[PDB]
Design an enzyme around this catalytic site. Structure first.
Site, PDB file in Angstrom:
ATOM      1  N   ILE A 235      35.305  40.837  18.909  1.00 20.77           N
ATOM      2  CA  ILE A 235      34.871  42.227  19.006  1.00 20.77           C
ATOM      3  C   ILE A 235      33.638  42.340  19.885  1.00 20.77           C
ATOM      4  O   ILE A 235      33.454  43.355  20.560  1.00 20.77           O
ATOM      5  CB  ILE A 235      34.566  42.841  17.621  1.00 20.77           C
ATOM      6  CG1 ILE A 235      33.600  41.929  16.844  1.00 20.77           C
ATOM      7  CG2 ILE A 235      35.828  43.137  16.859  1.00 20.77           C
ATOM      8  CD1 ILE A 235      33.144  42.486  15.488  1.00 20.77           C
TER       9      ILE A 235
ATOM     10  N   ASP B 223      14.712  47.237  16.785  1.00 23.66           N
ATOM     11  CA  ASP B 223      15.702  47.259  17.853  1.00 23.66           C
ATOM     12  C   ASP B 223      16.708  48.379  17.614  1.00 23.66           C
ATOM     13  O   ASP B 223      17.918  48.165  17.531  1.00 23.66           O
ATOM     14  CB  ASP B 223      16.403  45.909  17.987  1.00 23.66           C
ATOM     15  CG  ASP B 223      17.069  45.731  19.348  1.00 23.66           C
ATOM     16  OD1 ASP B 223      16.871  46.602  20.221  1.00 23.66           O
ATOM     17  OD2 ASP B 223      17.790  44.724  19.543  1.00 23.66           O
TER      18      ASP B 223
HETATM   19  C1  LIG Z   1      28.322  43.491  19.939  1.00 18.10           C
HETATM   20  C2  LIG Z   1      27.338  43.428  18.776  1.00 18.10           C
HETATM   21  C3  LIG Z   1      27.512  44.419  17.618  1.00 18.10           C
HETATM   22  C4  LIG Z   1      26.454  44.156  16.537  1.00 18.10           C
HETATM   23  O1  LIG Z   1      26.341  45.297  15.728  1.00 18.10           O
HETATM   24  N1  LIG Z   1      28.866  44.275  17.082  1.00 18.10           N
HETATM   25  C5  LIG Z   1      29.315  44.704  15.894  1.00 18.10           C
HETATM   26  N2  LIG Z   1      30.214  45.715  15.829  1.00 18.10           N
HETATM   27  C6  LIG Z   1      30.728  46.061  14.629  1.00 18.10           C
HETATM   28  N3  LIG Z   1      31.614  47.069  14.564  1.00 18.10           N
HETATM   29  C7  LIG Z   1      31.985  47.807  15.752  1.00 18.10           C
HETATM   30  C8  LIG Z   1      33.441  47.654  16.139  1.00 18.10           C
HETATM   31  C9  LIG Z   1      33.745  48.388  17.424  1.00 18.10           C
HETATM   32  C10 LIG Z   1      35.127  48.161  18.013  1.00 18.10           C
HETATM   33  C11 LIG Z   1      35.514  46.689  18.097  1.00 18.10           C
HETATM   34  C12 LIG Z   1      36.226  46.246  19.352  1.00 18.10           C
HETATM   35  C13 LIG Z   1      37.529  45.865  19.308  1.00 18.10           C
HETATM   36  C14 LIG Z   1      38.222  45.429  20.452  1.00 18.10           C
HETATM   37  C15 LIG Z   1      37.590  45.385  21.652  1.00 18.10           C
HETATM   38  C16 LIG Z   1      36.237  45.776  21.772  1.00 18.10           C
HETATM   39  C17 LIG Z   1      35.560  45.748  23.017  1.00 18.10           C
HETATM   40  C18 LIG Z   1      34.263  46.132  23.116  1.00 18.10           C
HETATM   41  C19 LIG Z   1      33.570  46.564  21.984  1.00 18.10           C
HETATM   42  C20 LIG Z   1      34.186  46.605  20.770  1.00 18.10           C
HETATM   43  C21 LIG Z   1      35.540  46.214  20.610  1.00 18.10           C
HETATM   44  C22 LIG Z   1      30.267  45.390  13.483  1.00 18.10           C
HETATM   45  N4  LIG Z   1      30.573  45.515  12.140  1.00 18.10           N
HETATM   46  C23 LIG Z   1      29.820  44.598  11.567  1.00 18.10           C
HETATM   47  N5  LIG Z   1      29.046  43.863  12.432  1.00 18.10           N
HETATM   48  C24 LIG Z   1      28.102  42.786  12.097  1.00 18.10           C
HETATM   49  C25 LIG Z   1      28.424  41.502  12.825  1.00 18.10           C
HETATM   50  C26 LIG Z   1      26.662  43.260  12.257  1.00 18.10           C
HETATM   51  C27 LIG Z   1      29.335  44.391  13.680  1.00 18.10           C
HETATM   52  N6  LIG Z   1      28.838  44.001  14.854  1.00 18.10           N
END
Ligand SMILES: CC[C@H](CO)Nc1nc(NCCCCCc2cccc3ccccc23)c2ncn(C(C)C)c2n1
Lengths: 248, 326, 826
Positions: B19, B145
């Site tokens: 992700i 942040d």
């Molecule tokens: C990058 C750092 C962040 C930290 O916040 N990534 C993050 N996004 C969390 N959800 C968001 C999900 C969004 C959609 C997922 C997705 C799927 C397929 C392709 C994608 C391409 C680009 C972007 C997203 C993509 C999330 N839920 C819990 N966590 C913990 C690890 C803190 C999270 N970290």
């Protein structure tokens, strides 16, 4: 949710160290030496008192799950302090912890670190984290000694004598398994109790409830004197066994 | 028991994809086989062994096991790679931090241009965020942040805060020396542009105000590449740092060094005249230059804009679905 | 880094705006027609239009207006680009030399503002005192038209009404006055404010009325004889001036939304109105003069004239000649007669100007075996739906195949000497409970026909209500022959079934060549389709046979043949099916880490996926294992419109913001993250909306010899009808051409003084980046059209490396050869 980090005195007859043929006196000696090693090393490096205690608590907890015969204590101690530094935001480089250890340890003792001291320590971090179940936040008797002392009102000099004497008792209790038997809040009360008894002070007069003779119950609910007396007895044991005496 | 972290293996999760990557590191979307729940795994690598276990992760583990709030992301457990048997020295497997899977992140939703916010969606959004920030600030924790990429939103309309890699404890009585630059340049407070280094929790309030404005324009308010140009943009809107509006600005290290083109007057209310009255007041107080005059997290919740927002009626954002595909 | 080249093969053909006035001379009547980025100037004659000049601008033309301030002999032209570049332009002719003067210019973008829903609106005062711009919600921007404002400096007046539908400057007022329809929670209303240049604020307006139709769409400023305004809606047309209020609600206009208006008689007695179904109306204002000497408006009347192309803009011109500027079908010149013809129509077509219209899809096929290539495009919408066969012959030859219904996807099946086209036609709920088509179309006039009888969704149990008059789309599959474009067969899909994807291929060990269609069950209640089908057809002996059907739990947005297996994307899932010996589809592998798998392309065992918001992902089929692997993903968030694979390492994408980008696999295996990170190595603002990327070229290349510096060929179609081409360059060739662009930009004078580097900068509402990795071929090919002094000024100190000599000075005649070789690629 959160792990349970307290054992009963009777349980210390069954640490891994005990069951590999180490006798109770020797494990106690190893615990004092490891803790004091942590204390001395970090004090030389200028570390905050919480950072020293956290490492000591990591250390004490570790040897509830492993034997002193398979994990050299001074390596374990050094690793704990290294992690403690990162946890408490007083970080130190591993090479500096090693350098200080060489100063304070003789050659035979430093033999525990093997051919590559830094490696033996850094490698152990994986085991330490798994052993302490990634429960890194730790509370220490110090903060409660001050939180409670702040609510005392009276002679400034008598209360400051009580605090410092109790503070010394806290530093001394880190060499024991009390950190593993009683929550820190109880320790803080216990050391206040011992300082009061030795100074011939009556702490209830300084509380908001001056006629509540069990003064501590308004800080720590549900603590019988039995617990406080056991803690005090164990603290004074260290002074009687050694050559050192009560600070007064 | 549920509390014995670090032992369960990552075999228990089916990895769906990657992700996320970047400064936070590699984050993978996975489903637990036993529970069938979607999770997010952050790979923490201690293999470098320059400083061993990363401190970014140590803070995120340390803080998120203490903070429990609807608007704070939950770390469910920590799991490991298959480890080498009886060879702890040889072992270099990495640890994975398990989180709940949030459907979207605010940056992704805004950058793709796929979302529209009404006033009531912004109310439901800001109320949760500032309630979460309140929980953390009352616990004397500074996020440090706050950006759109670190705010996570489920389709349910629930908002949760996320990257606590840079978070540290704040002493309300005593000043402590901190890292000079912590927040992203777009969302950095003016005090940190001038290098306070002893920053208050108000640094996080400034960042949320930049988001509050961004939700009404769909474009960040202050976009700059260099610290001076950012101060210029802030000054064109909020006014230039003056000893008159910021009594201790003279104490800040770079006050004399970093000067804006002019001593600008504040135009915030004029340039944001298209914002509702209740919100415009919230923006003016959150985007206050003086850290001491800048409102608190609690004060935003006791505002005309967010006070009477019933958190039960979530009101989800306008998600695009098939309509935007066609 | 990557190096690519992008050129226009056919320029934008869609009409985006048209005005008439006296621009080239105070004497001639001119028609200025705006196509995306292109301005065409004509002179009105008695037979039609005489072209005089065409210029390109480095921007999408958003506002176009002609005005004549006191002291000018002839009209001046105002243009505002979609990136907020403003300018005032003048026509100047010196004998045979025609040029366009930039009289004033500047960029009017605000640091803070919310772009409005109804888009940029630009209007000019009848006394030409100021230009009004509606760029952001809650703000009105004023550029005062004083002689000294050569930079077009402007100020903003706070506007209480945040949601404005449309605004015009009214006629007959003591001060400049605006009339605008706004929408708030109580409905839409019509209000007037006055504009004070001295005070730089609004003052109370002449008249305030409310409660205008909920769907009030357009504002007309009626000229001085009548004064006031007319408000056009879905059901009613109303006139508001002071106390006077007139309203006409003729049932004829309720049938189709009216989208354009123009004034016929300068007194305001007559106006033209057009609607989405192509009807052209006359709005007549009936004068009643009182014995006072004053003239008042007595009544409003609407009369149907006939049919035109679905018009974006109308212009009355002169005599009975009207210009039908069209965005969805062919632009037109039609004559209005006083007497109706025998069919009852007053409208008779004169000339038809080709519009490739919306290009929904296209395929490149060599029909005549000329080793060249033809482009059969799915172009047009609704009654303008067409198929355009385009071949290169110096101009492009375009044959049009009218469909009268919307085309969606086209694929070629050589085995059958025919084409498959997915279509949509609009039917309306009628009194029988069923639906009735507004006109016959390809699906209704097919020689043979069939209808799906599938029982997959026949279990229904989901109630959906119908109201008389509501529109519903009916999707069909059309089999059309390549020699005669006669529709041989029409297959109608299920009620509420949308055809989204079509492929022609063989699968597995099956020797038959099939047409395969992927569908989605679309119900108004559903945010995202939750049912769908993959249907396998066989076209044999003039009949389409249903071979097999596979039910899916979503919309089959995209499909592609993959090494004898069928690769399909169902909503979030990317799936690979095998074709069994029992002629049924069987799933092999799945990938679920997507939001919406809108686009799919393949090469070898690599798959490029296009997502609604997560940019592009490279997947690989591991044949050893029988599953999918995530090779690399672009983590920057982009809203995709189309994707294409350039080579094993470079991937091309198109954004919904009219931007192009190229991603490259890092191929540096130091760390797992670097490999998985697709790097956006190319960024380019195209200015068009790209629906389809197709590998191929229209150039005559029967035998390979004299191949050009460019390698590879990708053609793309856009909404505005532009057909383009993307090709790759070597590192050295790119740097030569890039160094030359920077030289040409210093030499070439831009219309409106718009910086070329600004125009091509990547642009979304949230970002602006300088272009990278792309050579604007249309700039390079303009070197041939600049005067000789300018050519030699360009070539000074030009040194090409990597050649026989590390540095070699280029002459003008050397470059004229290089540019000419580049011009042959299209
Ligand atoms: C990058 C750092 C962040 C930290 O916040 N990534 C993050 N996004 C969390 N959800 C968001 C999900 C969004 C959609 C997922 C997705 C799927 C397929 C392709 C994608 C391409 C680009 C972007 C997203 C993509 C999330 N839920 C819990 N966590 C913990 C690890 C803190 C999270 N970290």
């Amino acid at each position: 949710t959160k792990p349970c980090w307290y054992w009963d005195k009777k349980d210390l007859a069954h640490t891994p160290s005990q069951l590999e043929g180490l006798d109770p006196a020797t494990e106690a000696r190893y615990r004092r030496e490891g803790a004091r090693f942590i204390f001395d090393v970090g004090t030389r490096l200028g570390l905050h008192y919480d950072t020293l205690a956290t490492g000591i608590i990591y250390f004490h907890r570790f040897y509830m799950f492993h034997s002193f015969k398979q994990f050299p204590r001074y390596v374990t101690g050094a690793c704990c302090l290294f992690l403690a530094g990162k946890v408490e935001e007083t970080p130190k480089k591993c090479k500096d912890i090693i350098k200080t250890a060489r100063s304070l340890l003789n050659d035979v003792q430093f033999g525990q670190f093997g051919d590559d001291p830094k490696e033996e320590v850094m490698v152990l971090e994986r085991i330490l984290l798994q052993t302490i179940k990634f429960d890194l936040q730790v509370e220490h008797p110090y903060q409660f000694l001050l939180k409670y002392a702040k609510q005392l009102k009276g002679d400034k000099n008598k209360i400051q004598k009580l605090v410092q004497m109790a503070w010394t008792f806290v530093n001394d209790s880190l060499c024991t398994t009390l950190s593993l038997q009683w929550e820190p809040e109880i320790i803080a009360v216990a050391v206040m109790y011992l300082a009061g008894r030795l100074c011939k002070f009556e702490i209830q007069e300084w509380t908001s409830k001056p006629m509540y003779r069990r003064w501590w119950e308004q800080f720590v609910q549900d603590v019988p004197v039995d617990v406080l007396e056991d803690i005090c007895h164990q603290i004074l044991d260290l002074y009687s066994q050694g050559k050192q005496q009560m600070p007064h | 028991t549920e509390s014995d972290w670090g032992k369960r293996c990552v075999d228990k999760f089916d990895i769906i994809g990657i992700i996320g990557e970047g400064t936070y590191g590699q984050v993978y979307k996975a489903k637990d086989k036993d529970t069938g729940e979607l999770v997010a795994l952050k790979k923490v690598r201690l293999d470098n062994e320059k400083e061993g276990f990363p401190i970014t992760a140590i803070r995120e583990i340390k803080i998120l096991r203490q903070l429990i709030h609807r608007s704070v992301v939950n770390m469910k457990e920590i799991v490991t790679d298959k480890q080498d048997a009886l060879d702890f020295k040889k072992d270099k497997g990495a640890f994975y931090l398990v989180f709940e899977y949030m459907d979207h992140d605010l940056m992704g939703l805004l950058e793709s241009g796929l979302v529209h916010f009404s006033e009531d969606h912004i109310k439901s959004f800001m109320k949760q965020l500032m309630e979460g920030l309140e929980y953390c600030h009352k616990k004397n924790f500074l996020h440090r942040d706050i950006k759109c990429s670190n705010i996570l939103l489920n389709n349910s309309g629930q908002i949760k805060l996320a990257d606590f890699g840079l978070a540290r404890l704040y002493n309300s009585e005593e000043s402590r020396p901190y890292t000079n630059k912590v927040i992203t340049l777009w969302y950095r407070p003016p005090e940190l542009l001038l290098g306070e280094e002893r920053y208050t929790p108000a640094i996080d309030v400034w960042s949320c105000g930049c988001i509050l404005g961004e939700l009404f324009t769909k474009k960040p308010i202050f976009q700059a590449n260099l610290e001076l140009a950012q101060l210029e943009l802030i000054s064109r809107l909020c006014g230039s740092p003056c000893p008159a509006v910021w009594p201790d600005v003279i104490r800040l290290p770079y006050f004399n060094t970093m000067k804006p083109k002019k001593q600008y007057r504040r135009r915030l209310r004029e340039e944001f005249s298209f914002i509702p009255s209740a919100a415009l007041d919230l923006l003016d107080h959150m985007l206050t230059l003086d850290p001491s005059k800048r409102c608190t997290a609690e004060q935003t919740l006791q505002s005309d804009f967010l006070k009477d927002v019933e958190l039960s009626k979530m009101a989800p954002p306008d998600l695009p679905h098939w309509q935007d595909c066609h | 880094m990557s190096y690519n080249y992008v050129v226009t093969a056919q320029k934008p053909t869609a009409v985006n705006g048209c005005v008439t006035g006296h621009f080239t001379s105070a004497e001639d009547l001119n028609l200025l027609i705006a196509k995306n980025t292109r301005l065409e100037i004509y002179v009105v004659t008695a037979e039609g239009l005489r072209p005089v000049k065409e210029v390109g601008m480095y921007g999408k033309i958003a506002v176009m207006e002609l005005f004549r301030p006191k002291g000018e002999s002839k009209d001046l032209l105002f243009i505002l680009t979609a990136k907020y570049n403003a300018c005032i332009l003048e026509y100047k002719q010196s004998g045979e030399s025609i040029d366009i003067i930039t009289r004033a210019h500047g960029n009017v973008q605000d640091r803070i503002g919310r772009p409005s829903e109804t888009g940029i609106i630009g209007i000019i005062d009848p006394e030409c005192r100021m230009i009004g711009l509606r760029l952001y919600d809650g703000l009105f921007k004023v550029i005062p038209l004083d002689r000294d404002n050569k930079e077009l400096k402007a100020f903003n007046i706070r506007l209480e009404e945040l949601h404005v539908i449309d605004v015009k400057f009214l006629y007959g007022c003591q001060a400049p006055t605006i009339c605008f329809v706004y929408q708030d929670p109580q409905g839409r209303h019509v209000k007037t404010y006055e504009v004070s240049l001295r005070e730089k604020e609004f003052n109370k307006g002449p008249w305030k009325q409310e409660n205008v139709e909920a769907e009030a769409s357009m504002v007309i400023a009626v000229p001085e004889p009548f004064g006031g305004a007319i408000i056009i809606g879905q059901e009613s047309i109303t006139y508001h001036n002071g106390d006077k209020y007139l309203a006409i609600a003729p049932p004829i206009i309720k049938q189709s939304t009216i989208v354009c208006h123009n004034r016929v008689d300068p007194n305001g007695s007559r106006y033209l109105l057009g609607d989405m179904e192509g009807r052209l109306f006359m709005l007549l204002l009936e004068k009643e003069e009182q014995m006072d000497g004053t003239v008042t408006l007595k009544d409003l009347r609407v009369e149907l004239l006939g049919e035109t192309s679905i018009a974006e803009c109308l212009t009355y011109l002169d005599n009975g000649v009207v210009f039908v500027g069209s965005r969805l079908g062919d632009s037109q010149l039609v004559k209005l007669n006083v007497d109706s013809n025998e069919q009852g129509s007053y409208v008779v077509a004169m000339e038809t100007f080709t519009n490739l219209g919306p290009i929904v899809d296209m395929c490149v096929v060599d029909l005549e075996r000329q080793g060249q290539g033809q482009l059969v495009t799915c172009s047009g919408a609704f009654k303008e739906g067409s198929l355009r066969i385009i071949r290169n012959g110096q101009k492009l030859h375009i044959r049009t195949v009218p469909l009268y219904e919307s085309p969606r996807k086209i694929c070629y099946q050589e085995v059958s000497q025919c084409f498959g086209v997915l279509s949509s036609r609009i039917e309306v709920q009628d009194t029988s409970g069923g639906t009735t088509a507004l006109r016959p179309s390809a699906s209704t006039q097919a020689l043979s026909s069939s209808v799906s009888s599938s029982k997959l969704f026949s279990s229904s149990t989901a109630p959906h209500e119908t109201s008389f008059g509501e529109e519903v789309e009916v999707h069909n599959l059309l089999i059309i022959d390549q020699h005669t474009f006669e529709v041989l067969h029409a297959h109608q899909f299920l009620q509420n079934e949308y055809a989204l994807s079509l492929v022609s291929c063989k699968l597995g060990k099956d020797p038959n060549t099939y047409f395969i269609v992927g569908t989605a069950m679309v119900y108004p209640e559903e945010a995202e389709p939750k049912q769908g089908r993959i249907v396998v057809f066989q076209y044999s002996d003039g009949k389409l046979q249903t071979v097999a059907e596979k039910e899916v739990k979503g919309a089959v947005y995209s499909m592609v043949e993959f090494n004898g297996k069928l690769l399909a994307s169902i909503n979030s899932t990317v799936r690979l099916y095998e074709w069994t010996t029992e002629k049924e589809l069987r799933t092999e592998c799945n990938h679920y880490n997507n939001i919406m798998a809108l686009y799919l392309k393949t090469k070898g065992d690599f798959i490029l996926v296009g997502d609604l918001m997560r940019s592009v992902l490279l997947l690989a089929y591991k044949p050893m294992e029988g599953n999918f692997e995530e090779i690399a993903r672009d983590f920057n968030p982009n809203w995709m419109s189309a994707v294409e694979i350039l080579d094993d390492d470079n991937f091309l994408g198109a954004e919904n913001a009219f931007n192009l980008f190229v991603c490259q696999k890092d191929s540096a295996a130091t760390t797992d993250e670097e490999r998985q990170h697709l790097q956006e190595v190319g960024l380019f603002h195209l200015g068009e909306f790209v629906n389809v990327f197709c590998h191929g070229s229209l150039v005559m290349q029967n035998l390979g010899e004299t191949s050009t510096p460019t390698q590879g060929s990708v053609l793309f179609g856009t909404v505005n009808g532009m057909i383009g081409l993307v090709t790759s360059l070597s590192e050295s060739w790119y740097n030569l051409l890039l160094d030359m662009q920077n030289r040409l930009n210093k030499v070439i004078k831009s219309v409106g003084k718009i910086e070329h580097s600004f125009w091509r900068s990547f642009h979304t509402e949230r970002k602006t980046e300088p272009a990278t990795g792309f050579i604007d071929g249309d700039l390079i090919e303009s070197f041939l059209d600049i005067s000789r002094p300018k050519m030699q000024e360009v070539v000074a100190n030009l040194q090409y490396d990597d050649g026989s000599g590390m540095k070699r000075e280029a002459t003008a005649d050397d470059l004229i050869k290089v540019v000419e070789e580049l011009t042959r690629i299209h």
